[PDB]
Ligand binder design. Structure first.
Ligand SMILES: Nc1ncnc2c1ncn2[C@@H]1O[C@H](COP(=O)(O)OP(=O)(O)O)[C@@H](O)[C@H]1O
Ligand SMILES: Nc1ncnc2c1ncn2[C@@H]1O[C@H](COP(=O)(O)OP(=O)(O)O)[C@@H](O)[C@H]1O
Ligand SMILES: [Mg+2]
Ligand SMILES: [Mg+2]
Lengths: 450, 230, 453
């Protein structure tokens, strides 16, 4: 082993043996080792098995000395597979008691990280050599996703099955984090509306959210209000994909909503002194925060959307919310022949992006004309025609309904209904809001509730 | 192209483009009132023929049926009252107590109009096409087939060619036969003269030559041209 | 050598034939350059001579010079780089052996794909090699290096879909837009002027990047109204106006425009029964048009959205922008791939028109046809649902206007000579009816000078 150009996976058997021997000799330092290394970081099956058994014994309330460990292994018949009482005694004896197990545990650390990086590079090369029907864009997306996942908290390997111990640790961490910040019933991104928060407990991360309504019902208004509320009530960036409108009109609508100034005055530039003061205050707040990003490109493929979202998260260390308006304008060139397959691919890619970035993704959608021919025009799930996969893959589905749009003499003027058609982890129902189209805004409904 | 080039040409020509001028005449269409009156008359006559059809029915169903009939007539182009009269005659020939479907009534009108023009109906035309497809391989050409009339020849040949070229099924063949009958009836009612095929060359013949004379001719050719190999 | 294929898989993926085809197509056709420019980059070429040729051609295209074989060879000769490329012999070989009548888009995509695959493989090799030889780098440094190397592949785009922008830039753009709108007092016309007072009041002109649909039954003045809007835009603005005519030839449109501008009776012009005053009016109109020269008309039939977009881009490049685009009518546009299903074809056409309008930052006005069942209703004033088979048209249209004339359906109409423009869908404002006066004798639309309720 001259090591003068040798290509060997990074590992150190001496460090593993020292760690195992030290843990055998002194069970009290186990915690100091349990924070620095996991079972998967070990390079051999016997060492992983020994570490797993020691962890099980320690968390079951038992000593992990040589005799107890050997007895526990023998009862499960796994003592022979490890190497035997001879190998266990060699581990106990050869490694001196007077050792610093912290450095050795940090050595059984990042060597595994470098090995995982080499594994990811090998997987990327292998996928490149044998596309198996994948396009270049798909290969680039796969490589970017892998190298992005590996470089985030490095909890374990790139992706694969995980022992229930790690998942339980993650679940307890999630519970503690959600309990450390009292938001009064909001465990996700705040929507800015109390009734909607009661119904949904915020926009949960890794969930696909669909907002649907007939034309002129106010989909873009509601989505932009959600974006503004998320930006004002959070610190993570909020990304907007607007394939239907230029960014300037969206910004004018946002100014009208935030500063509560008439939109026609802003569009025509005819404002009084108080309107200018309100606009100045809104612009000052927006330029103080600086966490809203807008992309008004048209005909975006799901790969481009995912790549841009990944770039934003890479630059700013996370995303708070993603918004798309709307999904019927997206393109899948390879599936341009069949619309149903294109919509299914779009929905699956959006769900995969939501899972990958751990962000809430809200996509807007349109309904069918036949809805206007029914006795009750309030949307239902089946009104998502051509998009059954949308109904199947969506974590949350909300329909917007304004009765004044179809009925001029409607008694419910200014009142919009958000109807929850599907909620994977909660109830369903109707939430009433006040629609101020003058400012292009939705507000909490102050009227009596039954 | 830029407008400047066309304007320069206009200035250079002037009176030449005035000689070209501009096509006249506009588009004129019949009013909806006439179609509504025709539909009302058809509905009244059918209700007279089939009183039990609308029994125990509210006005909404009657209006829906009327709208369906209007749509069917507009799609199929029912304008002249003579077609309506032919359809009513066929319906009075029919023995079904219930009200026929609008498509069936249109088919009755077209069938009666085709029969009036001295042409076989759809079933006879399809049977003739099948007989032709079975028997045409036994003749040198389509003009050698025992045709009854020029209309039969043209209809059968056109249907056979269309069916063989487009891989038509039986129902598609029947629909094409109905369309061909409608077109031929329209041509006949417009006067017109049906051409008498095209024919293809005479047969010639007259070869009274035997084996011995042919051998003598071959030997003479060999002697004259010196074909040593043969 | 001694290698059938054992050493033939060390070679990174590439395609010499596609490169040569692209270069030859560029040499023998300089009109498709942008299509090549949007799909390939100089670094996508595997061989140094091809990269150098593409770079020189890009430089010549940016300098405005032609990129034919002779000009490119001369430009390379002056810089002394002709010898390095491979010589005029190699340039002529590329020009000749590669056909001009070819589809260069497929070859450009082939060149793009191999470069991506090869760069991905090379980056994976570099990452693994760095992993095996840390040279003192920590795990975090190696992970950051790997991430940067991997994401540098999809990057390095010259200028194409700049992507997300910070709120600061968008806010600056919005402030600039507001200032520009206020600096020009047009009595509420914050866009392309239409020449009609009430229409400009309700719509604030024809806003850029909007899809505008004009719908009417046959014989309603739809084409006349569209031509009036085009003429008003051409007279009141200096930017070029492009017209697509899939139904009527350009000569008839020109004659109608002359008749409308000069207010000469169309019957006399169509019959040639003119006089000195008509000649003077026509001459004045033609003088004004020659002073402007800002109108272009294309009368090709069966235009696909790709051809329309390409021609609009070519006109914009030649004359520095567009003021308005007019299409008559959308139903005549053909999508070869979606010819089987009419609804999908209509949706594709509407989406492509919206994308083109957003890209060019110009108002696009497309003409559409309504359903005949409208004639059977008690009220014949069109609604959105009268756009049957075109739900995507209603969904994707920023503005929808229906042209109605009660005189067409009613002979004794009390509003004879009065036309209504009904706003079915106003995306950024209110909806209602605007009354105008229609002169079919002069084939023109004028402001309604009568009382307004
Ligand atoms: N200046 C304005 N004043 C009042 N209401 C407006 C104004 N501009 C737009 N609206 C309202 O906005 C609604 C549609 O907004 P938008 O969200 O863009 O539609 P969509 O639901 O298609 O996204 C319309 O019903 C209209 O009433
Ligand atoms: N020379 C003319 N004199 C009088 N009226 C005319 C003349 N030319 C056209 N019109 C009228 O203009 C209307 C619209 O014509 P046109 O623009 O060709 O059809 P569309 O309504 O499909 O745009 C017609 O109803 C016709 O009555
Ligand atoms: Mg919208
Ligand atoms: Mg027309």
């Amino acid at each position: 082993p001259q090591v003068a150009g040798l290509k060997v996976p990074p590992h150190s058997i001496e460090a593993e043996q020292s760690v195992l021997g030290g843990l055998m000799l002194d069970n009290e330092r186990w915690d100091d080792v349990a924070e620095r290394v996991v079972a998967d970081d070990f390079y051999t099956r016997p060492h992983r098995h020994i570490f797993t058994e020691m962890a099980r014994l320690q968390e079951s309330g038992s000593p992990i000395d040589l005799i107890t460990l050997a007895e526990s292994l023998e009862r499960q018949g796994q003592l022979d597979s490890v190497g035997g009482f001879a190998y266990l005694a060699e581990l106990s004896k050869n490694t001196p008691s007077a050792a610093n197990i912290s450095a050795y545990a940090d050595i059984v650390r990042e060597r595994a990280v470098v090995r995982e990086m080499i594994s990811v590079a090998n997987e990327i090369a292998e996928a490149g050599f044998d596309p198996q029907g994948r396009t270049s864009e798909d290969l680039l997306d796969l490589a970017e996703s892998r190298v992005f996942k590996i470089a985030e908290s490095r909890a374990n390997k790139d992706e694969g099955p995980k022992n229930i111990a790690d998942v339980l640790d993650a679940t307890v961490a999630r519970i503690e984090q959600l309990f450390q910040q009292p938001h009064d019933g909001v465990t996700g991104v705040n929507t800015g509306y109390d009734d909607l928060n009661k119904k949904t407990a915020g926009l949960q991360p890794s969930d696909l959210i669909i907002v649907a309504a007939r034309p002129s019902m106010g989909k873009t208004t509601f989505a932009m209000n959600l974006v503004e509320n998320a930006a004002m009530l959070q610190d993570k960036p909020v990304l907007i994909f607007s394939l239907e409108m230029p960014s300037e009109q969206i910004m004018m609508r946002s100014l009208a909503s935030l500063s509560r100034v008439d939109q026609t005055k802003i569009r025509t530039g005819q404002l009084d002194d108080e309107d200018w003061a309100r606009i100045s205050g809104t612009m000052g707040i927006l330029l103080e925060k600086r966490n809203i990003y807008i992309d008004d490109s048209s005909g975006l493929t799901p790969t481009e959307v995912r790549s841009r979202a990944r770039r934003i998260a890479r630059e700013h260390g996370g995303i708070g919310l993603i918004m798309i308006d709307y999904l019927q304008l997206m393109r899948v060139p390879a599936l341009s022949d069949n619309r149903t397959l294109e919509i299914a691919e779009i929905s699956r890619s959006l769900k995969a992006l939501a899972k990958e970035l751990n962000v809430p993704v809200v996509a807007l959608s349109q309904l069918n004309r036949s809805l206007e021919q029914r006795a009750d025009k309030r949307p239902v799930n089946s009104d998502l025609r051509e998009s059954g996969s949308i109904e199947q893959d969506a974590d949350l589905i909300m329909f917007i309904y304004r009765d004044e749009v179809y009925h001029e003499n409607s008694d419910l003027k200014g009142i919009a209904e958000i109807i929850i058609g599907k909620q994977r982890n909660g109830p369903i129902g109707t939430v009433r809001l006040t629609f101020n189209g003058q400012w292009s805004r939705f507000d909490n409904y102050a009227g009596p509730q039954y | 192209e830029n407008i400047a080039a066309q304007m320069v040409n206009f200035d250079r020509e002037q009176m030449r483009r005035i000689a070209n001028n501009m096509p006249e005449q506009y588009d004129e269409k019949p009013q909806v009132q006439q179609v509504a009156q025709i539909i009302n008359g058809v509905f009244s006559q059918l209700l007279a023929t089939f009183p039990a059809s609308l029994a125990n029915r509210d006005q909404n169903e009657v209006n829906e049926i009327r709208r369906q009939w209007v749509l069917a007539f507009r799609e199929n182009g029912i304008t002249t009252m003579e077609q309506v009269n032919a359809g009513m005659r066929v319906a009075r020939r029919q023995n079904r107590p219930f009200l026929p479907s609008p498509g069936q009534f249109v088919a009755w009108c077209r069938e009666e109009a085709s029969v009036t023009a001295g042409l076989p109906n759809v079933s006879e035309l399809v049977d003739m096409v099948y007989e032709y497809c079975r028997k045409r391989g036994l003749y040198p050409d389509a003009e050698s087939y025992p045709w009854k009339s020029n209309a039969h020849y043209w209809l059968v040949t056109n249907l056979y060619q269309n069916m063989r070229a487009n891989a038509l099924t039986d129902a598609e063949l029947r629909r094409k036969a109905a369309d061909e009958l409608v077109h031929m009836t329209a041509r006949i009612n417009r006067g017109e003269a049906i051409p008498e095929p095209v024919k293809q060359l005479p047969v010639m013949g007259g070869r009274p030559l035997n084996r011995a004379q042919a051998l003598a001719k071959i030997a003479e050719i060999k002697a004259k041209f010196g074909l040593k190999g043969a």
